[model samples]
Target: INTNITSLIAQKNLSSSQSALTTAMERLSSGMRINSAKDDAAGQAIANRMSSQITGLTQAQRNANDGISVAQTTEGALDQINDNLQRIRELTVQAQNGTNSSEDLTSIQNEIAQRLDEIDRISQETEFNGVKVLSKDTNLNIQVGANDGQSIGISLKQINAKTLGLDGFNVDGSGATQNSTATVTSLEGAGAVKNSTTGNYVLTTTFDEASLERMLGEMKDGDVVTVGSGASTAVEYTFNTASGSFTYTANATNAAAYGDLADELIPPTGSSITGTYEFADGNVATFAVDASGKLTLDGQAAYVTATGELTNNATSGATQATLEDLFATVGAGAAGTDTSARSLTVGGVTYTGAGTTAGLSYTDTATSSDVLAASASTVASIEMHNGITSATIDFDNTGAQSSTGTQVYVDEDGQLTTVGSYTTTFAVNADTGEVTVVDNSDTAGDYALEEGATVYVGSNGRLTTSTTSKGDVTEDPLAALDAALASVDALRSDLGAIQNRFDSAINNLSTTTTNLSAARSRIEDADYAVEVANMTKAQILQQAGTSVLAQANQVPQSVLSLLG
Candidate 1:
C-alpha cells in the first residue's frame, strides 16, 4: 500500500476531481443544469416541449384580440339599422291615425321608404376589412387556443330588406290605394240611387222621382245651391246634369235647396259617375261631397248628388251612402267589383293590397286630372282628399316643365325642383339600396313624383319576398318592431359572450404558461449556491492529492538509503 504505484493512484484521484469541478463551473456559468443532452437528457426534452407551448399561447392571445375587433365592427353597424327600423315603426303608428290627411300620410310613407333604403344600405355596406359581416349566412371562426380544435364561432341572419321580406313595400307594408279613370262620363239613371232612408245607396236605380220633381218645381233655373258667398266662395259647384231631378249648389244658397230635396240628383251634360277602382289592403274608399257636392273620389265619380245620395260605380258599387259606411267598407276588408283596381304602380314599383287593406297608388300621368288636381308648382302641396285628385284640372302654371325651360321634378324628400332640361328616367335597385336617374334629354330635366309616390330601384313594382313583406304593418307595428330589435340585440349579446370567453381563455393560458415555466425552471435551471460549494470542495481535494503523490514518490527514495 506504501509503494510508488500508490503515487500514480493519487494523481488519478486528482484528475477525476478536476473533471467534476469543470462540469459544476459550466452549470454555474450557464445558469442551467441541462446545457446540452450530455447534462440531463430527459429534463432537456421536457423543457423543449414547454418552450413550444409558450410560443403558441402568445400568438393565441393576439388572435383573440383580432376577433374582438371584427365583432365590434358588425355590432356598430347594427346599431344604426336598429335606429332606422325603430323610426319607421313610429311613422307607421302616425299614419294609422284617423285624423291624418292623405298628404300627411304620404309624407310619412316617403320617409319610411328612405329609412328602408338606408337600412338596406347599412346592411350591405358593413364589413370587416373586405369580408361582408351582415350577410345572410355569415359565420366567423376565431382561433382560441394553442391546440387543434380550439376555436369560437359566430353567425348572423341576413339583414337585407329582401331577406327581411320587406322588398317592395311602403312603411305600412301595404300597397297604395288607387283608381283608374281614363275618360269622364255622365251619371244617368243607369246606376243605383239612395233615398233619405238608411238603406245603403239603395244599391238600386229606383230614383226618388217624386222628390226630384218637387224640388225642381220649387227652385228657379239659375238660383242654384251655394256655399260661403262672394269672395269667400270656395264652393263653385253646379247642377249641370240635365238628366236627373236631384240638384246641387254651385254656392251655399243652393246647398239648403239641394239638401232639402229628396236624396237623389242628376248632373247636366258630360258629367258622369263612371269609374274603375281598386282598394289596396283593407282600405274602404269614400267619395267626398267636396265643395262641388258632386260625390267623387280620386277625380272619379261616385255619383253622389248635393242631396247626399250616391250612384254606385262598377268598382265600388254602392256599399253605403254614408261616409261611415265607407269607413266600414274599407276597414272590414270588404271587396267590391272595383276593388280589383287596388293594384297600383308608382315609379315602376308595383304595390298590391295585403290582407288588411288594399295598397295605395298614385296618378303619375303627364297632365293634371281630377286625381292629380294639385299638379301645380309643387306636387307635395296637392291634396289627396279621399284618395281622389283635384275636382278641377291643375296645369303647370309656373312654366317650369316646358321644353325650353327646366322640367320640374320632385326630389327624394318630395320637393319640387328642376334639374335642367334633360329627359330623366328614375331607377331603383332595392337589393343594392341604390337609386339612379338617367338623363337622355338635350339638357337636364325635371320629373315630378306624387307626394306619396316612392321610386324603388327595380323597373318592376312587384316586390317578391321569401315570407314577409317590408311594407306590412300588422295589428301591432310596435310588436313587429320589438321583434326586430330583439333579433339585433341577441346577436350583440352573443358577440359579447364570445368575447368574454376569449378573455377568459387568455387568462387561463397565461396562468398555465407561468406555472409550466416555473416547473421547467426547477428541472433544468442551475442551483448556483450548490454548484459553487462543490467547486470549492474539488479545489481543496486536488491540492491535497498533489502533495500526497509527491510524498509517496519520496518514500521510494528512502528505500534507496537502505541500499547505501
Candidate 2:
C-alpha cells in the first residue's frame, strides 16, 4: 500500500494506449504505413525505390512522345518537298515539248527553279523543339523505361535540294544565249565568194605586194621581227641592210640541221648551202639557201632570193600572207628591175613598182575555191555584246556541240560570217563596206564558232560568245526531279517508321509505369478502413485506461483512509 503499485500499473497501461492512439492517428492522416524509416525501415526502403522507378517511368513516356513529335514534324516537311519535286518533273516534261518557244522555255525554267528553291527552304527551316529535323542527320535516344539502357533510337536523314540532286536542275532548254558581233576591218583584206555547190561563202584574199613592201619599208637595218612571242618555238628574224643588200638572220631553238655556209650564193640551177648560226640571246638557227635562190631558216622561208629576185615560193595556204612572207620578198631589186617602173608577178599578184614619191602597188585576181564549213571546224571564240551587257562563251573543242544555235566564223581574212543554219542574217553594205548582222528573233541564244570558244556572262545576264568547243551536257532535269521525288518518298517512309516505333515505346512505358505503381502501392499505401478501425479501438482503450488509472489512485487513497 505504501509503494502504490496499483497506481503505477494503471499509469503504465495508460501510456501504452496513448502510444497506440498516436500511431493510428499519424497513419490515418499521412495515408501511409511507412511514412519514414523509423516506422518500418525495410518497407520504407523498398517504397522509396518504387517511387523513384515510377517517376522515371513517367518521364520516359514523355521522352518517347517527344520522339514521335520529332518524326511527325520531319515527315510533314518531306511531304512538301515531295510535292515540289513532282511539280518540277511535270514542268520538265512540259519543257521537253518542241512547241515551246525560247521565251516559253524560260518561263518554265524559272518556275522549276523556284520550286527547287522552296524545297531547299523547307528542308532548311524544319525544326523540332529548336532542333533541325530534316536538314541534317541526327541520332536520338528516347528513354522508355525506369532503368538504364532502356531506350529507343531514332535517326533523321538529311534532306535538301542539293542532297536530292536537284540543285541547278532545269527542264527547259534555257542556257546561255549568244548575242555577239565581230568587226572585219579593211586592213584584213577580207573578200567573200559564194560556193556554187554548197551554197556557203568561200573567203578569199591575197598577199598584195604593196602591203608587203610597205611592211618592209617600216623596218630599218638591225630591226628584229619576232613570230610567236613568249613561246619556246618563237622565231626571231634580224634584218641587215648594210652594203646595199637587205639580208636577215633567223634565230630559234634546235637549229643544228644547217651546216656552216654564210653569205654563200645558192645558184638558180638547184645548188644548196646550209649553216647554223647562234645569236646573243642563246637561241640558234639553221640558215640554208636552197635551189631557186630561196633562203630558208629553220625550215621556214626567210627570204625569197639573196640576189633580189622576186619568187612565189612562200608556203602559206591561200588567205592572207603572214609577216614572214612579207619579209621574205624584201630587197630593192626584189620588186622590179627599174625602181621607177618595176614590174613583177608573185603568187598570182602583179606588182607595178611606183616611183620614190609613191609606195609599191599591186593587183590581184586570184580567189580561193575552198568553201568554209562550220561542221568541219570549231569556233575559236565570238565576242558577244547586247545593248546592255557583254558576255563570252568558252567551249571545250574535244566534243560535239552541246550548245545549240547558229555558228559564227571569223576567217583569216577577217571576214565575220555565220555558217550554221539559223535565223541570223548578214549583209555587206556595197557602198559603205560594212557588214550588218541581225538576228530575226532578237533573242539571245547560242552562237557557236570554231573550236576553243569561251563564253562569259556579263553583269546584265547577257552571254558574250567567243571561240570554244562543246563541253559535257547539263544534267537532265526530268530525271533529276524523279530521283528527288523518290528520295523524299523514302525519307518520309523512314520517318513514319520512326514515329511508329516511338508510339510503341510510349505505350510500353505507360504500361510499365502502371504495373510498377501498383506494386509500390501495396508496400507503402495505408488501408483507410483498417486504419479507421484501429483508431477507434485506440481511442476506446485510452479512455478506459484513464478511468482505470483514476480507480487505481482511489485505491491508494483507500489505504490512506485505513491508515487514518
Candidate 3:
C-alpha cells in the first residue's frame, strides 16, 4: 500500500464529513431547510416567490379591512340622512290635512322651510374621513385586492333641499287669474252743428273762458291742462268720478273753467280743460270730435241735422236721443210698440244702445252687468288683441293715485314712450277692444292648490301655482313625498351592499394569505425533528472520518519509520 495515496484519500473523507456537519448546523441554527441558494437552488427560488405572495396577500387583507371601515363610515352618515328624509316626508303628510285653514297651512309651511334648511345642513356636513359622503355625487373607491386595478367603486348621489323638491315663487298680485277681454263701447261726447243736406257735421262745443263770466266758487284759477306739460295741444274738461272737488291752481275769484279738448280737437276755441278716464283693463278710449262727427252709426240721422235743433227720440214711450246719436227723431209709437233691448256694454265704463226702448233696456242691463271689475287703485293695465298684439298704460303714480289729469296710453308708435316730463300720455286709437282681444296675458291671483286642486312643477324645478308654467312630471305632494323617501332608502341600500362586498373580499383574501403562507413554509421552513436527526447523523460521520484520518496519519508515520 502506498502510504501517501492512503493518507490523501483519508484527508478528502475528513473534509467531506466536516462540510456535511457544517450544513446540518446551519439548518438547525437558522431554522431553514435551505440556508442559501447552494443548499437547494430551485427550492430556494420557489420559496422566495411564495414569500412575496404571502406579503402581498397579508397587505391585501388589511386593505379589505380598511375598505370595510370606509363603507361603515359612509353608511353611518347615510343613516342620519335617511332619517331626515323620512321626517320631511312625515311633515309633508301632516301638511295635507283637510281642516287646515290658510293660517294653519302657513304655519305648516314654516316648519317645512326649517326642515328643508336642516336637510341642507345635514347633506353639507355629512362626511367620511374628511371627505363629503352625502353631498353631490360622491365617488368612493375601495381597494379590495392585492394586485393593481383591483378596486371597487361606489358612487353616491346628490341630496339637497333643492333636489328634495322644496321651492317657492312670487306671483304678481293678480294671483293666477287672467282677463281675456279688451273692449270699449257706448262712448259719447259733445260738439256743434255744421251745414245742411250737403253735409250735416258735428262741431266741438267749447266755452270761452275770457269772454264769458263763470261761477266763482271756492275753487279759483287752475293751470291749463295741455296735451303734455309744455305742448300746445290741451286736454278737455273737469275731473271724473262725478264728485271730487277741484282745487284750482290760482286761489283767487275769477277762475274760469275752460273746455279745451273739444276746442283743440274741433279747432275753434283754445280754452283748456283737463279730463282723463283710465279703465281696469288698461284701456283709454280715443276722443276726437272731428273724425266721427261726419259719419252716422247704424244709419242714424247725423248727430246734428242740417236744421239747427236738439233732436228727441222717445218710445211708445218717447225716447230721447243720446248726445252722440242725436238728430230728428222724437216719436211715440203704438200702445204696444215692440221693444227688444239691443245694447252693448264696453270697458264697464261705456255702452251702446240700439233697437226699441225694451231692447235698449235689455242691452243696457246686459252691457252694464258685464262691466270690467275696475279698480281705482289700478295704476297700470295691458291691452292684448287676439293674443297677437299688446299695449300698456301707466298711471301718474304707479296705481295708487287717480289717473284724472295725468293719464298715459300706448300705441304702435308710442309703445313704451315717456312723456316730456309730464304725467299725462295719449295715443291714437289703433287696435280697439272691438278687434282681437287675446287673453294670453298672465294676471296675478292666488291659485289655491287645495285638496282636489292641482298645481304643477315648472321645468325650472320650481313650483308654479298656475298651469301657464310647467314641466315634465306633475308632482302632487303625496307622490312627491313618497318618492323622496324612496330615494334616501336607495342610498342606504347601496351602501349596505358595498359593506357586504368588502366583507366577502376580506374573507377570501384572509383565506388565500393563510394558504400561501403554509405553502411558503413548506418550501423554506425547517422541519426541526428531521433537521435534528440529520445533524446527529452528520456529527457521527464527522467523528468517524476524523478517526479514519488519524489512522491514515499513522500509516504515513509507519512509512516514515521504514525509511528511518
- So what's the TM-score on candidate 3? 0.50
The 10-residue segment of model 2 with minimum total lDDT is 366-375
* Candidate 1: segments with Cα more than 4 A from true spot: 1-7, 172-479, 542-564
- Which scores greater on TM-score, model 1 or model 3? 3
| lDDT (C-alpha) at residue 3 in model 3 | 44
Model 1, span 1-564: residue lDDT tens: 255678889989989988888888888899888989997788889988877777777777788778888877877888898888788878877777888877787788789889989999898889877888887676777877778878877775577765554445454435532222111011112232423453222222111111111222332322332222244433222232343222322111222332432122333455433222234433444343433335466555554322222345533454324322322232223433233223322223232333343323221211112212322333111111221222222223341222332223333343333332222233334355332332223332223322222323222222111222233334555666667777777877887777787778778878887887788889888888989998898888888888988887777776677888
Q: Which candidate has the highest TM-score of all? A: 2
**RMSD of each candidate?**
26.7, 24.9, 22.5
Against the true structure, what is each candidate's TM-score?
A: 0.44, 0.51, 0.50
Query: What's the CA error at residue 97 for candidate 3, in Å?
Result: 1.8
Q: What is candidate 1's TM-score against the reference?
A: 0.44
Q: Tell me how many residue pairs clash in candidate 3.
A: 25
Distance (Å) between predicted and true CA of 230, model 1? 60
Candidate lDDT scores, in order, read 0.51, 0.55, 0.45
